[PDB]
């Protein structure tokens, strides 16, 4: 219950890029709820973002100090920044969202019994105890309300028990009566638990402004007032400013910020009477560290299990595989093998279809989760190498179910080779070709990080793999014959003809007998399996935070 | 300057679907600016939407009367409803947005000289005279600000010179100083031009509330107050309600609406003293009507000219045609004609490529403009049959430029038949096949009106057109031989072989000699040109308003 108070002080100076801040000074006591209010463009989104400790070094000079000391990464585990946008996964319920977060945030030396009841204490500490089985959703999946998405985001940050909670415009997008009941619980933290809540309200209401203990005006840099907030109106009356009509106190002193009198004399009056009074108050880790890698993998596989299933077994993607499998069983119904030219066109349609679908659907995976990943990683929850291996191991499970259902339905209708040993070789070649074609699309989406531009580069790439696959053109013109050795469609189609026909000898046009080999064609699809996953990792470690 | 005043009166009763409204009475004088404010769910979005005249008949009973009469379509040309969302075209500048609207809204009997200076009077009557050459844009195209998108929407409605302007939450999404300067011009209309502006502000500010002449509270049905707005605070003081702390007057009396005292005694006190005092105040057209059809077509072709060009000459669609034309000229470089099997696979790749691209890109045209069309049509600007023929005639101009550039580059590299009469027959067959494949996608998107679901039904349809086109399967199994006669890819590929080879006789495998005919293959692609445009119209007149 916060038996470690943080007395935040800051006497900093400008933050340039023009100056955003210029001269801000102030101090925050434990047990106070403070609002930082000002016009749009006054740098209130930077004073919060530089007193949590997220801006430093180059163009930020000052003497920000926590607890009469220095802002250190030791005194940054007791600090929580609730940002302005919410980044949650949709298909998880509210209770299992905060249990997956509680197993990753809280340290390893505890047990899994004082760790998942610290996640259902925060359920009842905020108001999230009625909606704990509703899914979260988004604006395509019906779930919790917009005032309870913000309460999950604050509950995401209270699991580590901070002593300083910085929030960046919480009540933005909330209606009139949920923005009031969210200020009631943030004022209850600082008055009941002894924390040091600091927030920046955009345009406060009339009875929201009564819930504050301290305000701080910012007008394009320097500050005009810092004080109790019940005596802000009486202060400017002594300077000679009073409203002409009954009005909100937070509309009055925010009009005085952007020059509208009812801003040159206001700054000079501040550094004569009020600013020189707040200045007066101024041998292991080898075998365990590999075992902590795999528990981060076992939790990241269970979180993303319903996310790797929504995109895989989509209902408009089941319809495309069921439609393509009735058309193959009807155009090649009860086929004969003694007419080679139709049997080779069946086997080449399977190479086109299962190279285009896994590659095109794989370019959307990494661009859509870049914002969630770079926030979740820069708080010490996981690294790149365990998030990457949860997408690798979780996507080669789900994507083998629709090609195995295509080939059970179609193999025995179209009369391919009878036997259990030719059926299992045709299935094995096709499931390796689907995994080698997926990795082409994973590498292209990670190198580009735009879903529209990556979609037209995997489309152009597969066009050159189909045309060099060996079915349309018989005599490649002598400077383009090298190009077929880099395509995945070439090695699959030359394998499938080797199961069904072998090398002549029963059917003897020598488009059956090839020029590659069989172990050379399965040794290269393994090189393209691993090789396109290594290049997807290196394109992702290039986005240096 | 509004020399026709409208004195709006309404003594209506409930509007059910539960009751939304219950007992509302009131009257509006000319020259008054009135706000309709209340909590979210109190039916203030229906009292406006039923006093403009957009709700009537079944479950709406009352005695709404304009100018001591009856609400008639004669007295509805002097009425303007500014809705809550803005539906504009992005690539147009602000000046030519309001000139294209001025040629369609203002009547035909004027000239085109007192019609396009009535569109640059409204430019300066509002504040749209500095940004009149900036494009409008959206949130993908950088253009005008969000407070000036709302001023174009009010300028869209002032061209007909109304005398009663009803606005539905104008200042929603605007910041603090643009919401004030938009109320300054709406208060200037009613105080300077004599109009009868009626609006519904969501959460007014402190000095926005000083700009009102009349308010009307609504609490879930019945009304609590209607009066001057400068004496709303003194009225509830006589009922026994006063604030305990200095506050916005529009936050106080909106908390009294949803029950929070500082709502059962408030309604009963209204129908004793205040409600029985507002009740006391209570032979041509044949040759001209075809000439007015084509001027609506000549303006709708010029509006949409930059919209049919942004989607056609997209930069990621030029790259796909330039890439596919280097790969054809390189895999078939300097080809020989005496080897028939490679020449037939070239001609079938052109049939696949130019059937898949026009059909897939055409399903997005009509779903993305359904909201703009059904608003713009139910105000008497155009009909369905002139909006349809501007999309038909405007899309068969732009989509013939990339297939003509594909075939100029590639025909002479791959060594097809030399001559000017075989070159112009190959170009003519391909440009008819692109127009017949576009109309398949126009008909599917108009029948479904969802872009995701229509994209997987044109993809399944073209898969059955490719497999029955006549290249992969040689011997179709006796109950599927009918199916090739409905595919567009069949008739194109059998035409292209007839230009290049004829019927044997120089090359004599009889996959050259077909079974259809030549005039039978061009008579059916014309039947699929017109036939897929008739079905797209009938699917669009099915959405009955
Ligand atoms: C691989 C590819 C990408 C494109 O550029 C478009 C295109 C339609 C040509 C294609 O889908 C090619 C499809 C082919 C050759 C055959 C088919 O589907 O039967």
From Swiss-Prot, chains A, B:
Q: What induces it?
A: By abscisic acid (ABA). In cauline leaves, activated by cold stress, but repressed by heat stress. Within inflorescence meristems, down-regulated by both cold and heat stress treatments. In developing siliques, activated by cold stress, but unaffected by heat stress.
Name the positions where ATP binds: 38-45
Question: What sequence ranges are listed for the domain ABC transporter?
Answer: 18-245
An example Pfam family from this entry, by short name, is ABC_tran
Briefly describe activity regulation: ADP and vanadate (ABC transporters inhibitor) inhibit the ATP-dependent abscisic acid (ABA) uptake.
**Matching InterPro entries:** AAA+_ATPase, ABC2_TM, ABC_transporter-like_ATP-bd, ABCG_dom, ABCG_transporters, P-loop_NTPase
Gene inactivation effect: Hypersensitivity to abscisic acid (ABA).
Q: Which UniProt keywords apply?
A: Abscisic acid signaling pathway, ATP-binding, Cell membrane, Glycoprotein, Membrane, Nucleotide-binding, Stress response, Transmembrane, Transmembrane helix, Transport
The reply on keyword Nucleotide-binding is yes
Reaction catalysed by this chain?
abscisate(in) + ATP + H2O = abscisate(out) + ADP + phosphate + H(+)
Q: Which Gene3D superfamilies match?
A: P-loop containing nucleotide triphosphate hydrolases (3.40.50.300)
The UniProt GO MF terms for this protein read: ABC-type transporter activity; ATP binding; ATP hydrolysis activity; ATPase-coupled transmembrane transporter activity; efflux transmembrane transporter activity
In the bilayer, the protein is annotated as: Multi-pass membrane protein
Where does it sit, as one GO cellular component term?
Answer: plasma membrane
Any one biological process term the GO annotation gives: abscisic acid transport
- List of glycosylated residues: 59
Looking at the record, the residues that make up the ABC transmembrane type-2 domain are: 295-501
PANTHER family registered for this protein in UniProt: ABC TRANSPORTER G FAMILY MEMBER 25 (PTHR48041:SF56), ABC TRANSPORTER G FAMILY MEMBER 28 (PTHR48041)
Its biological purpose is as follows: High affinity abscisic acid (ABA) transporter that mediates the export of ABA, with a preference for (+)-ABA, through the plasma membrane, especially in vascular tissues (e.g. phloem companion cells), and is involved in the intercellular ABA signaling pathway. Together with ABCG31, export ABA from the endosperm to deliver it to the embryo via ABCG30 and ABCG40-mediated import to suppress radicle extension and subsequent embryonic growth.
Q: Which family does it belong to?
A: Belongs to the ABC transporter superfamily. ABCG family. Eye pigment precursor importer (TC 3.A.1.204) subfamily.
Query: What is the protein name for this chain?
Result: ABC transporter G family member 25
Upper lineage ranks?
A: Eukaryota, Viridiplantae, Streptophyta, Embryophyta, Tracheophyta
